[PDB]
Each structure stands twice: as structure tokens, then as C-alpha cells.
């Protein structure tokens, strides 16, 4: 509309209305020029790719993309508390995206010093993939999402994708994608871009911990009319065989007949956070649960949803079982245990097997007069009829949605890193600096982004008499307030925050 | 565990009538409810009564509007391993209240 | 902590009171005032703070 008239205002806040929450977030972004406007082939052998399991082939593009797919984008810590303490469930409904107050800059080195000034004729290209024709990279827990703290300015990530490969070489079925082939909108410093999205119907992400365990659902006061086999022998001696039977009742609860059985397991190795009680060998890769695809071994991470440890063992975590977050200011490679934050899935133990334990036992043979009964450990167990399980929890730092791969079939599409699986997730938003001339003007753009999600809530109806567990802040006096910036102005998140505090009956 | 209301004494004047043990001072508090067993005959039949009482109060709330960024202090029960659940009965069936609970957790600016 | 307190019977002789028509009433709980300075958890102000009994607490002493 004009160079001297602003194209949009600054909206950040949350409106709590009844069963719904509306969270608006507005950030200031900066987009450079990537690859000097050049689509480029990339593969492992460029960096040497010494492992076959690491072999990849794909392209890096000039375009950038916005990623708001982590929760702390949309929720302040306070708003996250109000959500998790008061609600049994939630899920997104509507999405509203806006891109405005674009500004483009040109970079020049005059004499020995660098110069930057407004380029008022330059444009920015932006488009959304609403037919989902491009490779969808959002659901891969990538870095580069909108910053948790609104006063930070962030650098848009460079889009890219991969396709089929054999070793580092491509194949005849491989694909290539020119984002320029998509109709896009072009924006001058007076233009602004917006669109509205509609989440597809998804189940509420449960945010509660069961107050009953799957094997304790019985009435403690009453016997069962069913019978179990108590004794196979009368006593010590020869030819003592017998069959005795007993009522399943309160005195012995292990053997009662039950209608439902815990969810599936794929065993993880168990690592202790006290190092001296860990095997003295490198088992990070050699001892890890993996799955092989087309000859390549992928680590199983995080894997099926399983409790992190038995009750009473808090120093043990699954090797690839849980989500691990870094503390503010943590180095990219080989950091110490204190620097990282390891999340735990103890809340779901009531219905899910422990990740480091065998699912159970099965008989391996037929007993006979000459053969004793023999059993073996079930290390992994697929779905059986009558299993129940809980999904993995979502965190303030964790992902929100993923795209369900488009396939003939799937089971329980809910993604393994947590969040809402969707066949048509929020579409990707691609952006780039229009090239201004293989010799171009060095140029970058900056502007604002606002995003608005409407969340639906499931209120807590419970009749529990005694008070709940609630997420709270300790009243101890410390040098810096938690979830606030320090003297140098750095914002940090002290710990991961789960969603499961309130309880329900099983 | 504390009191709810008190009756503001009927006097010429008072200042900040809010009662000192806490709660809502009122000139016309909830009225007293008196009850007795009708005497059945100075020699009477030894007699007592029993029954039910239900009471219903409607409370108005003031919602928390704060813009505070970092998370509040909240009243919570710790995750503990003990013989008895708090705010519940023991083996002999006795109900107990483990600690006094105050009303002040959320914060405001001064 | 009992050792810090003075070794004398000052429970009634040291208490804030108000007199009405010749009778002394203890000041309880009194005006609303903070119980202790910051970082001084051990101290309590005599009659100033409400005191509740635990379940099964004896009536006297």
C-alpha cells in the first residue's frame, strides 16, 4: 500500500475463553540469500559419508521456510502451566498465519567498510504448499523454529530435501523439485501475506496420569469365581503329580484373570546416570536397538512409547528411548550429562511396559514326564487384541504435529516423538529473496511473522478427594528467576516440562 | 480450617471491619440456626434425635489475568512414598488434615 | 528451637494484651502483620499467628 505505512501490527497474547485457547505469537525474522540463488546437489560423499547407514542424496535450495512446530513458540511458561494444571486434554483447531512489514536490504562493501541500505523495489517470494506436493521436512524435529522468547530475532532456515539413493548415487526413480515451478506471491515492502488453515480432526492429547495401574483394576475385597492351577505336585517324592485349583482372590492378585494387557514393547538397553555402574565399554552404537531398512540400520529413537524405568529407579533411562533436550548454551558435539536434559516417561507406566524390561514370558516347549517346563523372555511384542497403551507426552520444547506418511496402511498414526499425527498438517511456507543481478547484488530481507492457533480444551471433571499434583515453581531464593533472562540478557529454559499432572481412573 | 465470616459488632463506628481471624466481616452474616428436642414428660423421657443437614453456598470468583512470564508457585502435593495418602483416612479409619493450607499462591503487582 | 528462647516463664508475663473495663485480654491474633523477617523461619510472634491442632491432639499442655 505504501512505503511509509505499516502493513500490520504486533500481536502476541493468549485469550482463555471457556473450552478454547487462542495463542497469538509475533516474531521478527531475517532471511539471507542461500546458495547464491542456486539449487545444488548434495550427498554424503561431499563430506565423505564413511558409513553406509549415513548415505544420503538430495538437494539444497535457495528458499527458506518458517517452522513454528514447537510448543514454546505458542505458549509462555505461565500459559503452559494454566494448560497442564487445569485440563485433561487439548488439540489444535484453526491456524492463522500473517507475514508483514517486509524490508529488503542490499549489502555493499564501500572502500574497506560494509554498507547496507533500503532497496525499495525488491520483492520477496512466499508460497504455501496446500496440495502437499513438496517433501515435508517439518515433522523431523529440526532446529530453526520460531524462538521461545518473543524478544529474540531469528534466522529463517534453509529449505532442503532428500530422495532415493543407492550409496551416495541417485537412481532412476529419484525425483527433483524446482520450487519456482509453484505459483507464489511476490511482496514489496508495502505488501503483506496471510492465510488461514483448518486442522483436521485429531484426538485430544491426553494430559493426565492414571491413578490406577492396569493390573490393579480389581476389587480388593472380593474373590473371583474363576479358578487357577495352584499345585502340580502334592509333595516331594516320586510320582507326585497332581492338579490342584484355587480361587483367584485378594490374597493372590498376580494370577487373577484380566480383561486387558499392557501395550507393546521393543526393548531398549538400560543406561545409568551414575557412570561407575555402567559397563566399561563403548556401547552407544553397538548395544543400541535399531531397525534396518533397505540394508541400512536406523537407530530406534525414541521408539514405541514405554515407561522409562521401574518405580524406584530414577537413575536409569532408555538408551534411545527418550527425548533429550539441551540446556541453554550447550555445545553441538560431545557435551556432558549435566548440560543436557533427559525427559522421562514414568507417568505412563500404569499402562505401558518398562522400556528396559522384557514384556514377559512364554512357554518354549511341551512338558512331559521326561521334560520340565521351559520358558523364554519376550524382548519385543507386537500388538495383541486387548492391549491398551498411552502415547508419548508432549513438552514445552517438543514438537506439535507430524505428517502421517502417505501409504497404503498405518497403525495408530500418532507420531513417536509425541504430538498430533495428521494427513494434512499445517502446510509448509516457503520464502526467498528475489535475485537481483551469475553475478548478483548481495541482499537480504527482514520482517515480522505472526501466527495464531486456536486450541480446544477438555476440562477436568474428577471427583478425587485429596489434592492433585500440580506443576509449580519452588519458593527457594536463587541468583536468577527460572524461565527469565540473566544479567547478560540470555533467556533459558531450566528444565523440560511434561503435560501430565492431573489424574484419571483407568 | 479457618473461619469464613464474622458478625461486625453493632456500634457507632468501626474501621476496616474485616475480622482479625480472617474472613468476611458482615453486619448481617448468615443467621443462627437453633434446634432442640421437644421435652416429653421435672421428669421427662430420656430422648434424642438424629437426622441430616445439607448446606449450599454459591461463591463468586475473580479470575487471574496476569502477564507474568515465568511459572507461578502453586499448591501441590509432592510425589512421595509414604504409608498414608495425605488428606485421607488411615488404617483405623481416621481422617486427618496434614497441614494448614493458605489461600495465597498466585501473584500480583503492587 | 527451644534453646534460643529465654529460660523463664514469660508466656503470659510477656504477651501483648489490651485492657477493657479493668480486664486484660490477650491480643490474639491481633492486627495483620508478617510473622517473621525474610530468612527467619524459626521465629513466630507469640499470639500473632493462628495455631491449629493436628488430628488426635490432646486438649491441654
Amino acid at each position: 500500500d505504501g512505503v511509509g505505512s505499516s502493513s500490520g501490527n504486533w500481536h502476541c497474547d493468549s485469550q482463555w475463553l471457556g473450552d478454547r485457547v487462542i495463542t497469538t505469537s509475533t516474531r521478527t525474522w531475517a532471511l539471507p540469500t542461500y546458495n547464491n540463488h542456486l539449487y545444488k546437489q548434495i550427498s554424503n560423499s561431499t563430506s565423505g559419508g564413511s558409513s553406509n547407514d549415513n548415505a544420503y542424496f538430495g538437494y539444497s535450495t535457495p528458499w527458506g521456510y518458517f517452522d513454528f512446530n514447537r510448543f514454546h513458540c505458542h505458549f509462555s511458561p505461565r500459559d503452559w502451566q494454566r494448560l497442564i494444571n487445569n485440563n485433561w486434554g487439548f488439540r489444535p483447531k484453526r491456524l492463522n498465519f500473517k507475514l508483514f512489514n517486509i524490508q529488503v536490504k542490499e549489502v555493499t562493501d564501500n572502500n574497506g567498510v560494509k554498507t547496507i541500505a533500503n532497496n525499495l523495489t525488491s520483492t520477496v517470494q512466499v508460497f504455501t504448499d496446500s496440495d502437499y506436493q513438496l517433501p515435508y521436512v517439518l515433522g523431523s524435529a529440526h532446529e530453526g523454529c520460531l524462538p521461545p522468547f518473543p524478544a529474540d530475532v531469528f534466522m529463517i532456515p534453509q529449505y532442503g530435501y532428500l530422495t532415493l539413493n543407492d550409496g551416495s548415487q541417485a537412481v532412476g526413480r529419484s525425483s527433483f523439485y524446482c520450487l519456482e515451478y509453484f505459483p507464489s506471491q511476490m511482496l514489496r515492502t508495502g505488501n503483506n501475506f496471510q492465510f488461514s488453515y483448518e486442522f483436521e480432526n485429531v484426538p485430544f492429547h491426553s494430559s493426565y496420569a492414571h491413578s490406577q495401574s492396569l493390573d490393579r483394576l480389581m476389587n480388593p475385597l472380593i474373590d473371583q469365581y474363576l479358578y487357577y492351577l495352584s499345585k502340580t505336585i502334592n509333595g516331594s517324592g516320586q510320582n507326585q503329580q497332581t492338579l490342584k485349583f484355587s480361587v483367584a482372590g485378594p490374597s493372590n492378585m498376580a494370577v487373577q484373570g484380566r480383561n486387558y494387557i499392557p501395550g507393546p514393547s521393543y526393548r531398549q538397553q538400560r543406561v545409568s546416570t551414575t557412570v561407575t555402574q555402567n559397563n566399561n565399554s563403548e556401547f552407544a552404537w553397538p548395544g543400541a536397538s535399531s531397525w534396518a531398512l533397505n540394508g541400512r540400520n536406523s537407530l530406534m529413537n525414541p521408539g514405541p512409547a514405554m515407561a522409562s524405568h521401574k518405580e524406584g529407579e530414577d537413575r536409569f533411562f532408555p538408551l534411545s528411548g527418550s527425548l533429550i533436550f539441551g540446556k541453554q548454551g550447550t555445545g553441538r558435539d560431545n557435551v556432558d550429562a549435566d548440560k543436557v536434559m533427559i525427559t522421562n516417561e514414568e507417568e505412563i507406566k500404569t499402562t505401558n511396559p518398562v522400556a528396559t524390561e522384557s514384556y514377559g514370558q512364554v512357554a518354549t516347549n511341551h512338558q512331559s514326564a521326561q521334560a520340565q517346563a521351559q520358558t523364554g523372555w519376550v524382548q519385543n511384542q507386537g500388538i495383541l487384541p486387548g492391549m491398551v497403551w498411552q502415547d508419548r507426552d508432549v513438552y514445552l520444547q517438543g514438537p506439535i504435529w507430524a505428517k502421517i506418511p502417505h501409504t497404503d496402511g498405518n497403525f495408530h498414526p500418532s507420531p513417536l516423538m509425541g504430538g498430533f499425527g495428521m494427513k494434512h498438517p499445517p502446510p509448509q511456507i516457503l520464502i526467498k529473496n528475489t535475485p537481483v543481478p551469475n553475478s548478483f547484488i548481495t541482499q537480504y530481507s527482514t520482517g515480522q511473522v505472526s501466527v495464531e492457533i486456536e486450541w480446544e480444551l477438555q476440562k477436568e471433571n474428577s471427583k478425587r478427594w485429596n489434592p492433585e499434583i500440580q506443576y509449580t515453581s519452588n519458593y527457594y531464593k536463587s541468583n536468577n528467576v527460572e524461565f527469565a533472562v540473566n544479567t547478560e540478557g540470555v533467556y533459558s529454559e531450566p528444565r523440560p516440562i511434561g503435560t501430565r499432572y492431573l489424574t484419571r481412573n483407568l | 480450617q479457618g473461619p469464613i465470616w464474622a458478625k461486625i459488632p453493632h456500634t457507632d463506628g468501626n474501621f476496616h471491619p474485616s475480622p482479625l481471624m480472617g474472613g468476611f466481616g458482615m453486619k448481617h452474616p448468615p443467621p443462627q440456626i437453633l434446634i432442640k428436642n421437644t421435652p416429653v414428660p421435672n421428669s421427662f423421657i430420656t430422648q434424642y434425635s438424629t437426622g441430616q443437614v445439607s448446606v449450599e453456598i454459591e461463591w463468586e470468583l475473580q479470575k487471574e489475568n496476569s502477564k507474568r512470564w515465568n511459572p507461578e508457585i502453586q499448591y501441590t502435593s509432592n510425589y512421595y512414598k509414604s504409608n498414608n495418602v495425605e488428606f485421607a483416612v488411615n488404617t483405623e479409619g481416621v481422617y486427618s488434615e496434614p497441614r494448614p493450607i493458605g489461600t495465597r499462591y498466585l501473584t500480583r503487582n503492587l | 528451637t527451644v534453646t534460643q528462647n529465654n529460660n523463664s516463664e514469660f508466656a503470659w508475663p510477656g504477651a501483648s494484651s489490651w485492657a477493657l473495663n479493668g480486664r486484660n485480654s490477650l491480643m490474639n491474633p491481633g492486627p495483620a502483620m508478617a510473622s517473621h523477617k525474610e530468612g527467619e523461619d524459626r521465629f513466630f510472634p507469640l499470639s500473632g499467628s493462628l495455631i491449629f491442632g493436628k488430628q488426635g491432639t490432646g486438649r491441654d499442655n
Partner: antibody
Amino acid sequence: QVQLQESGPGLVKPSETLSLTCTVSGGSISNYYWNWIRQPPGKGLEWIGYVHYSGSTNYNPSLKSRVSVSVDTSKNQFSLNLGSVTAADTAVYYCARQSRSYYNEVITDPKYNFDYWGQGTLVTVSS
Amino acid sequence: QSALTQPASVSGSPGQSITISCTGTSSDVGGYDYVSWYQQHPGKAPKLMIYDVSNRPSGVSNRFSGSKSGNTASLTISGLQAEDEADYYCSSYTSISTLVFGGGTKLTVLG
């Protein structure tokens, strides 16, 4: 992860004052109660006393005369000064931390259950 | 004050519950429900197994348990193992708000 470390001279001549400092790392002194425990070699634990950032202290009645415990919030360390030592004071000295109280509801003195411990230092009292 | 009194040593075979006791005066133990149990491996700092008579911290197995009758508090170790051999100390809050420890008890796992 809170770690405590005791430091100080390992040898003390009789009738001289003994001095030790515990430096907490990973966590600040905060609202916690810092305690000193000593174990004579091959004998049971004994509680020396504690200190609080308000400067409050509580001492073992048998040692109350000759002992002192100080806190420095700036340097994030608290100290032990035990005077007029004899050979009965040879022991391993631990610094410990009173467990955090989750409730601010009542006014009470601390009940001692220790959450963290130093590694301990041996201090020999000899001529 | 006067120390709490414990047996010097207790032994048991792996798999068998074991009970250690500490006797204290009415003012120190009998009076309040604040008795802690510490295990100490040789050369290590004590670890807190049980606090507030029967409570236990996170990180301690079911097998450890404690109880109080009169002037005597008792620590029970169920289904004991090899790693469970250590010195166990009774701790108590006193009338004058002082801490008092038991003499210590050594647990030997027969085998």
C-alpha cells in the same frame, strides 16, 4: 546435580583451632540448612551443628562451647571452626544439606534428614 | 545428648527379611516421628534410606522399610541382596532440637 567439597588442613596441633570450608557447586546456598557431621574412624556419626544464610546456627550441646559455624553467601561456601581440639577430635568431617521443604505453610525448626553429602575429609589432631 | 542404641551387627541370608532396631529415650525418638536411616558403604558418605520414620526418598526400593513402636524404631530390609551390605545408622530429632545418631549397625550378607 549439587556437589559439596570440603577443604582444609589435614593436620591440626592440639589446643589449636580447626578450620574447614565446604564449597557448594551446581547449586547456590539458597534457603538450605548446611550441616557438619563427623565420623571418628571406626565409630558412629556425630552431628556438629548447622548454619543458615540468615546467620542462624544450632550446635551440639557437648561441643557448644568451643565450636562455630559460619556461612559466606558471596563465595558460595560455609565454614567450620572448632577450637581447643584434642585427639578426640580426629575424624572424617562431612558437609551435608538438609532436605528441601516443599511447604511454606507452617513455622517450625528443621527436622534433620540429609539430602546431599560431601565426600568427607580426614582431619588428624596430633602433636 | 545420649546416643541412640543399636545392635552392633546383624546378618542374614540373601532372600530373608532382616530387621534392625534403634532404641531411644522418650524425648528423642519416642516423642517425635522424625527418625532417619542411613546406609554407608565403606569409604562413602551416608545415603538416606528412610526419613520421617516410615517414608523413603525417590530412588529407594520397596525392599527398605521402617516402623516405630514406643521408644524403638526398626528398619526392615526385605529380600536382601549382596549390594545391601553396609553400615546402617539411626538418626533422631530431639527435644531441644538437636540431632542424635545411633551407634551404627553392620549388616553382613551370609554367602
